[PDB]
């Protein structure tokens, strides 16, 4: 069945049930990575993103192997665990990304897409290859998630200040030690990509952990943790995971603290992916920090004492938060939280 059993369909579909003409013909595209593609729509008056994934075939793509349906799987499997957290009771938290379906989809890629990718090439550039290349028979994963905002990347001179920035490390930190308590989760590639902004009328957003529920001031912006191709959780000791014990180029990368945290992860862990470490999210919760003081720039700096005290405890947070062993410890015990 499609959509681990929640579609009433068998075997795969064709790109059309997923993407209806109308749906299809209001596709624009808004971010990719060597993985593929992903766009934005709209359907019931309400935008989603659309992440496609060409799976089990001989080409290379964006100039790598295509993963196997096996391959695949636990990408699939950890958006819906994480997503499930949103309805949950002694551990919920809505700070992932919401999932509405996954299908496995068969066909050559179809030309309204191209046509939005070419706009996006055109525009602002794309890194990938043309996907005008598959085959009829081409297998792929299209993952429908909530539209969860712009990434923290493409809003480094858009933020207001840096109470904002506190706002955004405190629903980060929240998330993490939800699913850290709840399904021993590691991210694992939470570079600011990943990290998705969105206006939010709530003043305070809810989390639960272990049963205790809290709030954390929005700053008019809810946050929402995407892209789980490298992370880890598991449940009832069955662990779920990508093993990149023997990639190589995954710790090879130079140029931004990025970088540096996979080799810092592959030292905490020995090289044993299937482990459980969740050192790995304070070590990107660390490395987001970074970027808010370090390449984040906002709209208003820190002209006042009190907004020069947010900034003070925010670079506090940043020269201690790696003396911590957890997302769970950090907001449990970090001054920054309280
Ligand atoms: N659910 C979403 N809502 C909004 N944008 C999304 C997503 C998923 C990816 N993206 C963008 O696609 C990029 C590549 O992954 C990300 O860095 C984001 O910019
Ligand atoms: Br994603
Ligand atoms: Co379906
Ligand atoms: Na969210």
Redesign the pocket.
């Known amino acids: 069945f499609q959509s681990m059993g929640e579609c009433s369909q068998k075997g795969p579909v064709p790109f059309s049930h997923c993407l209806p003409t109308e749906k299809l013909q209001r596709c624009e595209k808004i971010g990719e990575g060597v993985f593929g593609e992903?766009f934005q729509t709209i359907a019931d008056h309400t935008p989603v993103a659309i992440?496609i994934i060409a799976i089990e075939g001989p080409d290379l793509v964006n100039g790598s192997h295509q993963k196997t349906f096996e391959e695949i799987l636990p990408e699939i499997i950890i958006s819906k665990e994480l997503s499930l957290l949103s309805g949950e009771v002694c551990n919920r938290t809505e700070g992932f990304?919401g999932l509405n379906s996954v299908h496995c989809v068969q066909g050559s890629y179809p030309p309204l897409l191209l046509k939005a990718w070419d706009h996006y090439n055109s525009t602002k550039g794309s890194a990938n290859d043309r996907p005008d290349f598959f085959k009829d028979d081409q297998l792929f994963i299209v993952?429908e998630?909530e539209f969860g905002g712009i990434d923290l990347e493409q809003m480094r001179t858009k933020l207001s200040s840096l109470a904002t920035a506190k706002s955004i490390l405190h629903q980060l930190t929240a998330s993490l030690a939800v699913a850290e308590a709840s399904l021993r989760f590691e991210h694992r590639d939470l570079h600011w990509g990943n990290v998705l902004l969105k206006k939010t009328s709530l003043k305070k957003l809810h989390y639960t952990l272990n049963g205790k529920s809290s709030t954390i001031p929005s700053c008019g912006l809810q946050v929402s943790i995407?892209?789980?191709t490298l992370s880890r959780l598991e449940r009832d000791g069955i662990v779920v995971f990508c093993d990149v014990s023997m990639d190589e180029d995954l710790f090879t990368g130079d140029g931004d603290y990025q970088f540096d945290i996979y080799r810092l992860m592959k030292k905490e862990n020995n090289n044993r992916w299937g482990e459980y470490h969740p050192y790995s999210n304070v070590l990107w919760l660390h490395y987001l920090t970074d970027k808010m003081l370090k390449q984040m720039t906002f709209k208003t700096k820190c002209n006042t004492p009190a907004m020069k005290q947010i900034k003070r405890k925010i670079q506090e947070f940043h020269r201690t938060m790696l003396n911590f062993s957890s997302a769970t410890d950090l907001l449990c015990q970090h001054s920054l939280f309280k």
Do not use: E, G, S
């Open positions: 992903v992440k990304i993952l998630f995407i892209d789980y």
